[PDB]
């Protein structure tokens, strides 16, 4: 949790990184989304791309993005250390992120944190010896009505209970892909035990349209 860089044998400007040819084509499309003369707007998406290819951001990757976009390296470092989704240390294969802000706290997200810690034998902020799971607390993930919820890599797992989360870790260790979403009865954000709205057939085109178009 430090915001200074000290070169180490596995993280220095000579650490091998470079985009694959497939990613170099994705980068071209990213840059075309912005006006000519404002290529620096691509810093966030291109940095994220480097992390998706590599899993984390060595300083060499930051320099590579700076070189590609012709942006001073410090301006890339500033972005990398501001946004919390960028990993400047290697993380596990599965980055478990437990929301602990108040709405999730009110639904016993602490029990979810306990279940993950007891099952994995690690503490918040640590990685397992096998380097499969890294566990952190995060702020509201925009799924508060489905609390308690966690994010693992790109997926949300919601309305959790200590049992449900323990199963998901079993599925990940075994190599399977657990389907995202609520683990209770419901499918998304509707009230449990039956809809209280949107029960009628949706109205079709042209319904209630004002005269004169």
């Amino acid at each position: 949790a430090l915001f200074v860089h000290r070169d180490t044998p596995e993280n220095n400007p000579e650490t091998p990184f470079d985009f694959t040819p497939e990613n170099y084509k994705r980068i071209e499309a990213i840059v075309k989304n912005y006006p000519e003369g404002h290529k620096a707007a691509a810093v966030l998406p291109v940095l994220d791309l480097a992390q998706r290819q590599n899993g984390w951001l060595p300083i060499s990757a930051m320099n590579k993005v700076a070189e590609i976009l012709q942006v001073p390296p410090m301006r890339v470092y500033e972005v990398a250390t501001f946004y919390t989704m960028y990993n400047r240390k290697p993380v596990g294969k599965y980055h478990i992120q437990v929301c602990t802000t108040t709405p999730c706290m009110l639904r016993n997200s602490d029990s979810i944190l306990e279940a993950i810690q007891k099952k994995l034998g690690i503490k918040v902020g640590e990685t397992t010896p096998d380097k499969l799971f890294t566990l952190i607390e995060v702020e509201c993930l925009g799924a508060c009505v489905n609390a308690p919820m966690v994010q693992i890599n790109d997926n949300y797992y919601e309305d959790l209970t200590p049992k449900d989360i323990e199963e998901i870790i079993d599925e990940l260790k075994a190599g399977k892909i657990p389907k995202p979403g609520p683990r209770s009865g419901r499918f998304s954000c509707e009230p449990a035990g039956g809809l209280t709205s949107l029960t009628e057939p949706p109205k079709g085109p042209g319904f209630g349209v004002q005269a004169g178009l």
Partner: protein, 263 residues
């Protein structure tokens, strides 16, 4: 022709459009407090020491950044203004280290002086303070970054004046840190100037370190001969010895900067 009339504490003054509230106060000889604003740097508006009341406006405005509007009355000394300064000074000093006796800025420090003139006379902060690691940026500027107040003057000067995009802020929140992220030296021919524009003892002259105090120096206004520009300088001496070189403002020559060889 296009000058507009504004009032500073009820005193009319005619100012060009685009003039900020801070610049309007200057015209009547009132200097608004500031930390992040430097007239030769880009406007930042982040320290909030320049907050000033506009009559009938419920919100204090940042004087350094807010353009004046015709008929505005700036209350530079209202209780609303004075309370804003006290609140900001209190936040500025909450984590600042108790370093004045060992800090080279002592005696010519804008934080000290504005705390005296515009802040409260005591603390109500009952927590532990932040402490930051120092960073080595070369043999000329010593960094004691726990004193930094995150005004970003050094960043803007390095980017705009010196044309070096090496300084920046990393992290965010209370943990936001000014520096180079990596181990880098800020070795520009104009680097030493960031000692002058840093309002606090975060950036100080390494050669000058610990040798004098401001009140005991004699200022000899003189000229630089290290090149052919003829930069106006102040030769600081004490008890018959030259202690340091400072810039002297000359708009048509060196503005308020000197080169590192001159310094």
């Amino acid at each position: 022709s296009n000058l507009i009339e504004v009032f500073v504490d009820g005193q009319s003054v005619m100012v060009e459009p685009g003039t900020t509230v801070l610049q309007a106060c200057e015209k009547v000889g009132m200097q608004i407090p500031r930390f992040c604003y430097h007239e030769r740097l880009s406007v930042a508006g982040n320290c909030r020491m320049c907050l000033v009341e506009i009559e009938k406006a419920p919100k204090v405005v940042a004087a350094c950044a807010m353009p004046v509007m015709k008929g505005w009355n700036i209350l530079t000394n209202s209780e609303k203004t004075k309370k804003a300064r006290e609140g900001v000074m209190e936040f500025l000093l909450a984590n600042h280290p108790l370093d004045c006796p060992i800090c080279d800025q002592g005696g010519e420090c804008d934080l000290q002086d504005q705390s005296m003139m515009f802040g409260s006379d005591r603390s109500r902060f009952l927590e532990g303070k932040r402490a930051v690691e120092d960073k080595n940026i070369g043999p000329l500027v010593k960094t004691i970054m726990t004193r930094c107040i995150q005004c970003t003057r050094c960043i803007r000067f390095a980017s705009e004046i010196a044309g070096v995009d090496d300084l920046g802020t990393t992290g965010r929140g209370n943990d936001m840190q000014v520096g180079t992220y990596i181990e880098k030296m800020f070795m520009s021919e104009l680097s030493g100037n960031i000692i002058d524009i840093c309002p606090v003892g975060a950036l100080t002259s390494k050669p000058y370190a610990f040798t004098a105090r401001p009140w005991e120096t004699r200022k000899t206004e003189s000229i630089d001969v290290m090149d052919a520009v003829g930069s106006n300088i102040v030769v600081s001496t004490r008890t018959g010895e030259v202690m340091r070189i400072l810039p002297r403002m000359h708009e048509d020559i060196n503005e308020e900067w000197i080169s590192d060889k001159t310094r």
